[PDB]
């Protein structure tokens, strides 16, 4: 479920996207953006040609 005992507890990067925020403080960006959208293909016609 996790690693071994810490016994140190330094300035970490605990998961900010859900739950515990951070050591330094608030974050600006927590995810990278894929700039190319996913578009479905067009359908096909069988009766129009005839």
């Amino acid at each position: 479920m996790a690693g071994p005992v810490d016994n140190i507890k330094p300035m970490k990067y605990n998961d900010p996207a859900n739950g515990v925020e951070s050591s330094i403080g608030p974050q600006i960006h927590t995810r990278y953006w894929y700039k190319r959208a996913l578009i479905d293909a067009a359908k096909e016609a069988y009766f129009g040609q005839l």
Binding site: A17, R31, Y32, A37, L38
Partner: protein
Amino acid sequence: ADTFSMPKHYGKEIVRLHYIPLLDDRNVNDQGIDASGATIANGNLYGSSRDVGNITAKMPTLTEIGGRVNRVGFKRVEIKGKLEKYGFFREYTQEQLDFDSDPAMEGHVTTEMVKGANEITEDLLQIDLLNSAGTVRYPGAATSDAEVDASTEVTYDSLMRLRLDLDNARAPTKIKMITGTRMIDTRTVGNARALYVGSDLVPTIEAMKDNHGNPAFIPIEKYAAGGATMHGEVGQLGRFRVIVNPQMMHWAGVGKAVDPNDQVPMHESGGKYSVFPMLCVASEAFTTVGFATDGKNVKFKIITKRPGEATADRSDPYGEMGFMSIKWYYGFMVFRPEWIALLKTVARL
């Protein structure tokens, strides 16, 4: 598999946008002025419906005066992907090398460790592919892992239904049909797609009959004269090309209790049946994610420290031990989960 290089200062997540078409059931909206003019909670114009009676009642009709009628709208969706880290180490002492009878032990050990590390990534990729796939089919009134019995075996109808389900999602085929040749004792083969199966299902595949009481398996030797062959190919079962992967996994121990009153061996483990997968995965659907790879080639990071006075410290003022460790990153993120198909069956008919 393709690889995507995640940037350094954007966290541990990737997000992508998806655009829904107009005539779709996922396009729930509120711009709903109808033919006569009225706000209704339907702004997609009968989207994704194939009933004639329903369709010829929401068709957008117009009069000679026009007016505010037949408004529509659009929507958006998003998808996500993640990351993770892995690693392992090994330590030894100095006297193990000086007093061993084999002077070449170190090289063999290092090569074995590197080679073993080179397979964990493949195992991770296979596990990720298996655990993230839609359109899971159980042949015959099973619908779950807890209802798998000796009668839940792969048949021709199940394969045909799986192919139909794959085609309904507009998955792309990549293997063309062969019409035959002049070569005596050959057979014709239609267009198909790759299908990876383990080596434990070979006896079952060799003993399967089609809907008309004939052997459905066409060996590679029959049609290889006029066609092409890829690595690991053993033949075409239905409209799929079977590829035997020696490292394919399975679910051992899941299923119903074994019934001794059956005429078939039915591979078992721990008093219960076993489930074997048949996977049809198409490229350009999923992708892999790496990190801290400036040149994309250094996936592994290795740190080694030999015994001596460079590892003195205060817990061992003599320095009698050394170690070596490997660490790396890995992530998976999938588009179109309906383009990966899985069929769960039993073995050894």
